[PDB]
Coordinates of N, CA and C in Angstrom, one line a residue:
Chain A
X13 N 115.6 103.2 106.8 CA 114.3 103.8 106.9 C 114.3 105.3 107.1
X14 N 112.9 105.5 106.9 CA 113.7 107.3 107.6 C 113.3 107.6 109.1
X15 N 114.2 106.8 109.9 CA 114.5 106.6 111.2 C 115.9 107.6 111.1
X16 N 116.4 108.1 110.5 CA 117.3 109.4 110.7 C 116.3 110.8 110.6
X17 N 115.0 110.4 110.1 CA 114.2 111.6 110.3 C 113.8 112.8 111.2
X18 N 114.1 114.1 111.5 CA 113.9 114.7 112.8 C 112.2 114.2 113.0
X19 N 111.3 114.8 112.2 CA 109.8 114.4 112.2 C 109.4 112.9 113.0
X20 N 110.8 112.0 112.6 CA 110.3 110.8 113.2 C 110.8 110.7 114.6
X21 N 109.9 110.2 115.4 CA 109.8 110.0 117.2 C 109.8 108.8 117.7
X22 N 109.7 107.9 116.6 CA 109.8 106.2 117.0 C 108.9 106.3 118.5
X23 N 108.8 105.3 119.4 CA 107.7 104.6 119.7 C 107.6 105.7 121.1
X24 N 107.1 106.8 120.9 CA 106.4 107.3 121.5 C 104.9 107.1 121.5
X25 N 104.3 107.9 122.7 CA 102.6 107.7 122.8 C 101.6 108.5 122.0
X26 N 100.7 108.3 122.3 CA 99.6 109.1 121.5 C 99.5 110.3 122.1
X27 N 99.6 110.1 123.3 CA 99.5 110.8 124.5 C 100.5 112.3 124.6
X28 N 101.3 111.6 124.7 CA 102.5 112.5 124.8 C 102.5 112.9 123.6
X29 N 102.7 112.6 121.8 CA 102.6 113.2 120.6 C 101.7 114.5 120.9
X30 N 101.0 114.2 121.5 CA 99.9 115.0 121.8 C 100.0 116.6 122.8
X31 N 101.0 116.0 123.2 CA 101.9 117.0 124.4 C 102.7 117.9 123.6
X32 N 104.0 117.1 122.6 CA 104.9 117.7 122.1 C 103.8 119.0 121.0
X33 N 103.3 118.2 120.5 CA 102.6 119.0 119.3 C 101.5 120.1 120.2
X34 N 101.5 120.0 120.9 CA 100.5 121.3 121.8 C 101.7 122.2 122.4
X35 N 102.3 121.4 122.7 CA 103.9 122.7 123.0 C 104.3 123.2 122.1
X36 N 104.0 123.0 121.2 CA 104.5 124.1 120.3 C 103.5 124.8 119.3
X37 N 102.4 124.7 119.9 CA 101.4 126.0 119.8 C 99.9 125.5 119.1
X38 N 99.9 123.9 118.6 CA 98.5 123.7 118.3 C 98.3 124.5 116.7
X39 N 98.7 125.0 115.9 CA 98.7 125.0 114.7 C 98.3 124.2 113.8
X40 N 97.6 124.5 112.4 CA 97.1 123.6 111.7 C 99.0 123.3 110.5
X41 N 98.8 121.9 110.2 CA 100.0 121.3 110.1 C 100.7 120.9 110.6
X42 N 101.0 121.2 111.8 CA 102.0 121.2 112.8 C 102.1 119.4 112.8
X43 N 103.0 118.8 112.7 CA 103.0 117.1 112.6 C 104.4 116.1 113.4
X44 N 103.9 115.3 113.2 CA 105.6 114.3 113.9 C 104.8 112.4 113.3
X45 N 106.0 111.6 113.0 CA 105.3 110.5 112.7 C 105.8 109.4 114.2
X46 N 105.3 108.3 114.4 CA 105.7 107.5 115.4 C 105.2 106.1 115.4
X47 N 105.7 105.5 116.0 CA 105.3 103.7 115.8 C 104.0 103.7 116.5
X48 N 103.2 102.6 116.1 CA 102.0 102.6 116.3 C 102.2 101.5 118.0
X49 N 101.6 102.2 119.1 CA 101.8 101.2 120.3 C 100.2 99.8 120.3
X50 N 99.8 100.3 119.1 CA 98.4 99.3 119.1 C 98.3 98.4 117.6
X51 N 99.4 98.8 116.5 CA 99.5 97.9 114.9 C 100.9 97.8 114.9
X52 N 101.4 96.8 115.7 CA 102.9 96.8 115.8 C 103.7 97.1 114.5
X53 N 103.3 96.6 113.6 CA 103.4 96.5 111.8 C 103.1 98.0 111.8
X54 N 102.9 98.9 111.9 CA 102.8 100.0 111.6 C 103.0 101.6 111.9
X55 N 102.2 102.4 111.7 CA 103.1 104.2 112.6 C 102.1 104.9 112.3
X56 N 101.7 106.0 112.9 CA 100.9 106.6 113.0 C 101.6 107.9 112.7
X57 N 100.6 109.2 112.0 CA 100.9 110.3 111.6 C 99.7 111.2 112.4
X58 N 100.6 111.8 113.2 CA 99.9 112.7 114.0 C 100.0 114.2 113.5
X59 N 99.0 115.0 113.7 CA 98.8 115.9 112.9 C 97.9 117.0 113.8
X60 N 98.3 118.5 113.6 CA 97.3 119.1 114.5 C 96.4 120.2 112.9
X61 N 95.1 120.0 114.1 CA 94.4 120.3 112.5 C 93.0 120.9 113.3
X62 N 92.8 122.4 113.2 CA 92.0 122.8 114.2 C 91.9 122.9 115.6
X63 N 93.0 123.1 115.8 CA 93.4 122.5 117.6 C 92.7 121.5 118.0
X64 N 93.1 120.4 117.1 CA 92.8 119.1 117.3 C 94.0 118.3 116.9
X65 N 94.2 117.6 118.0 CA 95.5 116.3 117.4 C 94.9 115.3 116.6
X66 N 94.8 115.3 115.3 CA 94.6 113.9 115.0 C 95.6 112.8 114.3
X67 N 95.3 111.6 114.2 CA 96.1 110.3 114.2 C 96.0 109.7 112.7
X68 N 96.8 109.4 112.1 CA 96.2 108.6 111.0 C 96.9 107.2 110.7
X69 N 96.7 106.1 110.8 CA 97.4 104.9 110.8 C 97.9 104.8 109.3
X70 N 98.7 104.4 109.4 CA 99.9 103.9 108.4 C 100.3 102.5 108.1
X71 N 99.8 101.7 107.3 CA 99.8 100.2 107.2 C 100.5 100.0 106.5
X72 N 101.9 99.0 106.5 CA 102.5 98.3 105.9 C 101.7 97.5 104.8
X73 N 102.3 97.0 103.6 CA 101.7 95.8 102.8 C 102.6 95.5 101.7
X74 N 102.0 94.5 101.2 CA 102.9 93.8 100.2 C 102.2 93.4 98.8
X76 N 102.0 91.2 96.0 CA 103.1 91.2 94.8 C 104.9 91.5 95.9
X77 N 104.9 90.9 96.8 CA 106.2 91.4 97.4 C 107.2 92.4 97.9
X78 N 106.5 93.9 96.8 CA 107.0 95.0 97.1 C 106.3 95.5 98.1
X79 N 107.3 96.2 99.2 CA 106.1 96.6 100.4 C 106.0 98.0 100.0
X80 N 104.8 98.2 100.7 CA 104.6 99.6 100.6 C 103.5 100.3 101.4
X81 N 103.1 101.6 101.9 CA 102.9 101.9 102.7 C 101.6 102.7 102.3
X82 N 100.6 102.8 103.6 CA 99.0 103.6 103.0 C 98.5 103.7 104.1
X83 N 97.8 105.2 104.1 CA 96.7 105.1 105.2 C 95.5 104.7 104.7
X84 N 95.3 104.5 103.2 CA 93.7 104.1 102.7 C 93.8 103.1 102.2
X85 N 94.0 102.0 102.8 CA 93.8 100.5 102.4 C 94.6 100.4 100.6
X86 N 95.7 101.0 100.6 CA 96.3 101.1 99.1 C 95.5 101.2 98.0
X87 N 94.9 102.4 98.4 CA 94.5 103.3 97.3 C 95.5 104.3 96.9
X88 N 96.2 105.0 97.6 CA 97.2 105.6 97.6 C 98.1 105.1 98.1
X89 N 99.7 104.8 97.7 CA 100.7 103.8 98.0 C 101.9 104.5 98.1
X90 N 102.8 104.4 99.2 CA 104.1 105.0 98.9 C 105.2 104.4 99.6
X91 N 106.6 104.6 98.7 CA 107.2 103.5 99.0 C 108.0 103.4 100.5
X92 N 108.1 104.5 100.8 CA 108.3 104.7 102.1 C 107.5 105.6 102.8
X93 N 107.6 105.8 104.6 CA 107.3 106.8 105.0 C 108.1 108.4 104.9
X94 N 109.2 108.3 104.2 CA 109.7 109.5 103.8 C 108.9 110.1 102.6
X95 N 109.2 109.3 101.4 CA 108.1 109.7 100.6 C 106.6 110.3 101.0
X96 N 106.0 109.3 102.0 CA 104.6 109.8 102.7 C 104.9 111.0 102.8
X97 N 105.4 111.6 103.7 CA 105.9 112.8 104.5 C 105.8 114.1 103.3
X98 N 106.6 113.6 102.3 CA 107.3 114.9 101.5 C 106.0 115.0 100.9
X99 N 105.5 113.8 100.1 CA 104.2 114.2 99.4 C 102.9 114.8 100.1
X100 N 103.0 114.5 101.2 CA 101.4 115.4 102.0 C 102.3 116.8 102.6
X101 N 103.5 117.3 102.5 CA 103.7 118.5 102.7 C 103.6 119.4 100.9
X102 N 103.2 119.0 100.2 CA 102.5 119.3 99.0 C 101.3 119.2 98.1
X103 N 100.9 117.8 98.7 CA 99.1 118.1 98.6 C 98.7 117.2 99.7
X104 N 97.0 117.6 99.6 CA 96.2 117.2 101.2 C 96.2 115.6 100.8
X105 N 96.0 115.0 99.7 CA 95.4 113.5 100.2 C 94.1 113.5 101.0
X106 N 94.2 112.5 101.9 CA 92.9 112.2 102.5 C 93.0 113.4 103.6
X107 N 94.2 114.0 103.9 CA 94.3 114.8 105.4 C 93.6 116.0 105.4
X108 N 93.3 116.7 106.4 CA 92.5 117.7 106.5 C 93.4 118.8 106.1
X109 N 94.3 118.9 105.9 CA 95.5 119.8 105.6 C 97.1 119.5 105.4
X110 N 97.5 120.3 104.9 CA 98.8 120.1 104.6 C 99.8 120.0 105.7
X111 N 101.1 119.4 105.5 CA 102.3 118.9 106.8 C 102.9 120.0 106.4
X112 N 102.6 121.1 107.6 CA 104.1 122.0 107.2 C 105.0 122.1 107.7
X113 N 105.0 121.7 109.4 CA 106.0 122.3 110.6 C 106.0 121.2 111.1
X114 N 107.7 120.7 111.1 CA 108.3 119.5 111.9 C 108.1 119.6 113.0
X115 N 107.7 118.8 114.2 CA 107.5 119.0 115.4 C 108.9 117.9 115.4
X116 N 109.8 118.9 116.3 CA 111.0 118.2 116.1 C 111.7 117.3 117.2
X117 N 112.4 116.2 117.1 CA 113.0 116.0 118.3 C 112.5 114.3 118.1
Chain B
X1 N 85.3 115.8 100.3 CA 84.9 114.6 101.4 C 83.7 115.0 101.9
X2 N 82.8 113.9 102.4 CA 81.5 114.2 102.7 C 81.6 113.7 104.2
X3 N 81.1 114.3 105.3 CA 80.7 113.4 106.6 C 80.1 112.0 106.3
X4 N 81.3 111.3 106.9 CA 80.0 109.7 107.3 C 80.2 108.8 105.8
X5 N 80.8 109.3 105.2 CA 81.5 109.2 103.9 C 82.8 109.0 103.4
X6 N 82.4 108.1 102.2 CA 84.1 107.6 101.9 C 84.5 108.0 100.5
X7 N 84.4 109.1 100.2 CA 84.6 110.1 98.9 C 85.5 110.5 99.1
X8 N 86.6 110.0 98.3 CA 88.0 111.2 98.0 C 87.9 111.7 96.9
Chain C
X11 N 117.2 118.1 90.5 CA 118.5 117.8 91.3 C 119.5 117.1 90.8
X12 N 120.8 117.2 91.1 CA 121.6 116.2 90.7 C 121.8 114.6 90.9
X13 N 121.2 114.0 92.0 CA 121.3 113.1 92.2 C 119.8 112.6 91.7
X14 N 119.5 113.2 91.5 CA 117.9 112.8 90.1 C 118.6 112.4 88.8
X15 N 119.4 113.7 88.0 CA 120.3 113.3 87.0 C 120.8 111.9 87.3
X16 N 121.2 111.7 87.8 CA 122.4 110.2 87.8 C 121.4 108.9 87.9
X17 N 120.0 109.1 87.9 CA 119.3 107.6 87.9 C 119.5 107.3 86.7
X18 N 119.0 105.9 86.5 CA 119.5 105.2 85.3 C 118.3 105.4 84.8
X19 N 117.0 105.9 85.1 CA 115.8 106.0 84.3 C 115.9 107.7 83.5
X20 N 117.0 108.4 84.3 CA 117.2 109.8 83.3 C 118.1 109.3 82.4
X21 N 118.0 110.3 81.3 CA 118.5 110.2 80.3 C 119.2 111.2 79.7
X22 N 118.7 112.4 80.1 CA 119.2 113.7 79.6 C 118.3 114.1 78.6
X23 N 119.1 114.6 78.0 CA 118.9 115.2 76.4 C 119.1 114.8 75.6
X24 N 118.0 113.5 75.4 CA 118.0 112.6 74.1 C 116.4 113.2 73.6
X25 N 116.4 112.8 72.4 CA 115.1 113.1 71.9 C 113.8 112.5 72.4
X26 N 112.6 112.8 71.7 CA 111.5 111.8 71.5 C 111.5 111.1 70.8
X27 N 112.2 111.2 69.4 CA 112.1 110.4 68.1 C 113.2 109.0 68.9
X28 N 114.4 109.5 69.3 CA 114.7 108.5 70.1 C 114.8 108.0 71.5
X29 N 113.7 108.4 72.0 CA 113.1 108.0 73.5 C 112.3 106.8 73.1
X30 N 111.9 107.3 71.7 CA 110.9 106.1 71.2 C 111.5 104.9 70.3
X31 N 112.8 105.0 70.0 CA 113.4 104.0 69.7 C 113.8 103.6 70.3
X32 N 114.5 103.8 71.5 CA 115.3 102.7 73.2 C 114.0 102.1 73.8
X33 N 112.9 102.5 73.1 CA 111.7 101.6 74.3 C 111.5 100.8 73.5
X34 N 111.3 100.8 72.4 CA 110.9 99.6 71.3 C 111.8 99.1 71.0
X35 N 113.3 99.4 71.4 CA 114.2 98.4 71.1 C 114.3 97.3 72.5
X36 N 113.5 97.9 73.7 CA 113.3 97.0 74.6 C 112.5 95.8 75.2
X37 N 111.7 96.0 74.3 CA 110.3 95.3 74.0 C 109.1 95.2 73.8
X38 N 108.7 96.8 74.1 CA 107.4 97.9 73.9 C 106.3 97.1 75.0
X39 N 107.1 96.6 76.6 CA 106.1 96.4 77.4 C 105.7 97.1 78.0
X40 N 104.2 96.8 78.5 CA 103.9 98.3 79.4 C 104.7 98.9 80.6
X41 N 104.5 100.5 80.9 CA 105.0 100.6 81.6 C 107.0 100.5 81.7
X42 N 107.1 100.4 80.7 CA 108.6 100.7 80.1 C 108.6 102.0 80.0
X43 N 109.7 103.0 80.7 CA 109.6 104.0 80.8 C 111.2 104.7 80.6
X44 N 111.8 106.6 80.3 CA 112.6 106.6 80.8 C 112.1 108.7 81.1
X45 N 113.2 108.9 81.8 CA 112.9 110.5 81.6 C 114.1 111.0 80.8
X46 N 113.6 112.2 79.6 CA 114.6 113.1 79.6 C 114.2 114.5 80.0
X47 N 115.5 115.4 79.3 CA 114.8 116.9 79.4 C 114.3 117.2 78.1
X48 N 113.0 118.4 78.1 CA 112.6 118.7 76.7 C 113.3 119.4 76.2
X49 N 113.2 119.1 74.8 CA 114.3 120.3 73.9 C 112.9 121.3 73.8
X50 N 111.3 121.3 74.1 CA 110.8 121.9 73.5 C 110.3 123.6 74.8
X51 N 110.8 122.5 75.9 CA 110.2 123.5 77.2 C 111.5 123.5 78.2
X52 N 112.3 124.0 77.9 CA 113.5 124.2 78.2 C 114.2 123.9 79.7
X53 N 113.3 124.4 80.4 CA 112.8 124.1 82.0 C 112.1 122.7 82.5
X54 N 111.5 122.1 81.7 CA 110.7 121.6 81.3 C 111.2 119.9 81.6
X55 N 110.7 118.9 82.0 CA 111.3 117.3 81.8 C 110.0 116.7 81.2
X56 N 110.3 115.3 80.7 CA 109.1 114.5 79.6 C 109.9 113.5 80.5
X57 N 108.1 112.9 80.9 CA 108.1 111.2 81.2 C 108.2 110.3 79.6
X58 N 108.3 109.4 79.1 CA 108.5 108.7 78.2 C 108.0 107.6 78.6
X59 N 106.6 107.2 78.0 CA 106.3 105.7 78.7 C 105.7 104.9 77.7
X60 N 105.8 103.4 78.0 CA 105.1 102.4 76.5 C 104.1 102.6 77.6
X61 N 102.9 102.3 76.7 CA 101.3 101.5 77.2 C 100.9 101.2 75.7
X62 N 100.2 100.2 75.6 CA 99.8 99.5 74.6 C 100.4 99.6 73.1
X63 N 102.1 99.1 73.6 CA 102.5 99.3 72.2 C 103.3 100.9 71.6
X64 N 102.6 101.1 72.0 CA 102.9 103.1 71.7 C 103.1 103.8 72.3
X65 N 104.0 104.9 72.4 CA 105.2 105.2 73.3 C 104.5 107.1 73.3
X66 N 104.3 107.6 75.0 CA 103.2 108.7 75.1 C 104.2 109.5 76.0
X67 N 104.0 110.4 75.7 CA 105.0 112.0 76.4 C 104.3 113.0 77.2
X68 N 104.3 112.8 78.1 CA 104.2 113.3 79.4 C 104.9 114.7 80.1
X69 N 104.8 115.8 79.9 CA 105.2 116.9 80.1 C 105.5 117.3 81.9
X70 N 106.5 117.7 82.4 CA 106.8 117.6 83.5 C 107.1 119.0 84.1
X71 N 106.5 120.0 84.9 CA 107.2 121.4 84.7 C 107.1 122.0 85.8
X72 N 108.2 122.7 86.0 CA 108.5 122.6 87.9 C 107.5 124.4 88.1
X73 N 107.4 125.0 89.2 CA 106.7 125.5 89.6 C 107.2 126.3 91.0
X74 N 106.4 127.1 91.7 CA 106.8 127.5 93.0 C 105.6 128.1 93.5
X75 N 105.1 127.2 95.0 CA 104.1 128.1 95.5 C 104.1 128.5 97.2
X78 N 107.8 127.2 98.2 CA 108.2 126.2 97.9 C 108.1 125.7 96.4
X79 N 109.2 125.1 96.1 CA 109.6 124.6 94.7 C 108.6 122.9 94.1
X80 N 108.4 122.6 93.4 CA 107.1 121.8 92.9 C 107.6 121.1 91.6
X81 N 107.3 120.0 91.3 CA 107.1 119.2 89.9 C 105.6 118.9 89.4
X82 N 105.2 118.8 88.2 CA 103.7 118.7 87.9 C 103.6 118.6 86.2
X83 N 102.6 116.9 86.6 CA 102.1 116.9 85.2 C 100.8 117.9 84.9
X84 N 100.3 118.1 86.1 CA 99.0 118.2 85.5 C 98.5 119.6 86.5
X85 N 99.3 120.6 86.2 CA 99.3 121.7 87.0 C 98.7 122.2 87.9
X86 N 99.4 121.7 89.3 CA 99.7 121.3 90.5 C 98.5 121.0 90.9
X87 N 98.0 120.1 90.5 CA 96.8 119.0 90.9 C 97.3 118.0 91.9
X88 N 98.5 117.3 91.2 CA 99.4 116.6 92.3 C 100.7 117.2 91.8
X89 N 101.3 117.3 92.8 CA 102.5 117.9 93.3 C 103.9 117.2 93.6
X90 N 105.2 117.3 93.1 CA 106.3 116.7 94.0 C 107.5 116.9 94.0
X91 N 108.1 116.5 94.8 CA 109.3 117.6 95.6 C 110.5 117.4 94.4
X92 N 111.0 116.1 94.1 CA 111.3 115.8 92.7 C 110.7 115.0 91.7
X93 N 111.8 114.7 90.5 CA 111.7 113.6 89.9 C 111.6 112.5 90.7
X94 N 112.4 112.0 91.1 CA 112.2 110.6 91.7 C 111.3 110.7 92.8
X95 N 110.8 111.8 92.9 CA 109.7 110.9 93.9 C 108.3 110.8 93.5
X96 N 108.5 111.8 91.6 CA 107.5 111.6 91.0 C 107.1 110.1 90.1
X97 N 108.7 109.6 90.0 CA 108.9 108.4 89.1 C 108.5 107.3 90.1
X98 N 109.0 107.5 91.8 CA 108.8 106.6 92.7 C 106.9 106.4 92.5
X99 N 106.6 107.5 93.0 CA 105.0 107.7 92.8 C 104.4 106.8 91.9
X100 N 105.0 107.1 90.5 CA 103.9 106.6 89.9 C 104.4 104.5 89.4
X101 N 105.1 104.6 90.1 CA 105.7 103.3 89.9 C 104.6 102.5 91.0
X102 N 103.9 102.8 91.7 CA 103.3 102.4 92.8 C 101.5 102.9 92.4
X103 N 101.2 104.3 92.0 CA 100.3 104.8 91.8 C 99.9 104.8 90.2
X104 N 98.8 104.7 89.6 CA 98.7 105.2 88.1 C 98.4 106.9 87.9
X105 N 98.0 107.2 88.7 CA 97.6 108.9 88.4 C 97.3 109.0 87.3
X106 N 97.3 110.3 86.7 CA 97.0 110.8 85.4 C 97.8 109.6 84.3
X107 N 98.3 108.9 84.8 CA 99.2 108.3 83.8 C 98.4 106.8 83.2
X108 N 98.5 106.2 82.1 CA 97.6 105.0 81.4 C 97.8 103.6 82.0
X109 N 99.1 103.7 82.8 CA 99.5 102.3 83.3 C 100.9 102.5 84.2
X110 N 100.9 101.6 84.7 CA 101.9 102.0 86.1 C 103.3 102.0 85.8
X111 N 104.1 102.9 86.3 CA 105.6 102.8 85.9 C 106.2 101.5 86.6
X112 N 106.4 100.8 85.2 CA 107.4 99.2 85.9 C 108.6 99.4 85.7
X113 N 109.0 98.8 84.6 CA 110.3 98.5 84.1 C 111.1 100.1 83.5
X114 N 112.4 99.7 84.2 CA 113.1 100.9 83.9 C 114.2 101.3 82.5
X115 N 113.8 101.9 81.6 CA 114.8 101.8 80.1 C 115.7 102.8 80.2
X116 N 116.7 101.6 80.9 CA 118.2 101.9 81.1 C 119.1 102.4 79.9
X117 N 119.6 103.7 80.3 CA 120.8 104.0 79.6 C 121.9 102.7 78.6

């Protein structure tokens, strides 16, 4: 998976995503992804966007191929790597673009 | 996108 | 990228005249697809895909605004080929029908 990802934080909090990403200055784009502690099946993409942290759930699904969506698979991708790379090149549903790894 | 709205 | 080259859905630098004969020699189902490079846009790569029978070329052409791929001048955007081939294998976008089946070398 892209569990070798720096961007990825695995099962950190909302809370604390919210810490790292304000440490490092509250910028629009500024992002990190993490397991969701409330859709075990899924991860959340945190995002600062107006000096605002916001969250966007990430749902697993499956015809057998899994694949991955924050809009009920209107938009589908096959991984969360893919996710990542494509919204650091257009917005999607997001209020802005992924530019700066919040790393670690 | 529109507030209160599901327009992409 | 190089490790784009080496998918079994690139092809290189084979034609259209025969882009369109390895897809109809494979059964002209939808969504039968392969990529080469264009001989006409030098920089340039062509999706090659069946939808209804008939085999449609798709112009692919990289960009910088950071480096970019785009059919449809940077409307959607992506980092490569394969993540534009991954894309549309899952998404239809600008495209008539979804990338399925891969026309292997």
């Amino acid at each position: 998976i892209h569990r070798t990802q720096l961007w990825f934080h695995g099962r950190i909090s909302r809370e604390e995503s919210q810490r790292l990403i304000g440490q490092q200055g509250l910028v629009d784009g500024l992002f990190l992804v993490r397991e969701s502690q409330r859709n075990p099946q899924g991860f959340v993409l945190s995002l600062c966007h107006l000096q605002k942290v916001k969250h966007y759930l990430i749902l697993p699904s499956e015809e057998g191929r899994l694949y991955f969506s924050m809009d009920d698979g209107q938009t589908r991708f096959t991984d969360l790597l893919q996710l990542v790379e494509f919204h650091q090149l257009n917005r999607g549903i997001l209020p802005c673009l992924l530019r700066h790894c919040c790393t670690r | 996108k529109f507030e209160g709205x599901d327009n992409e």
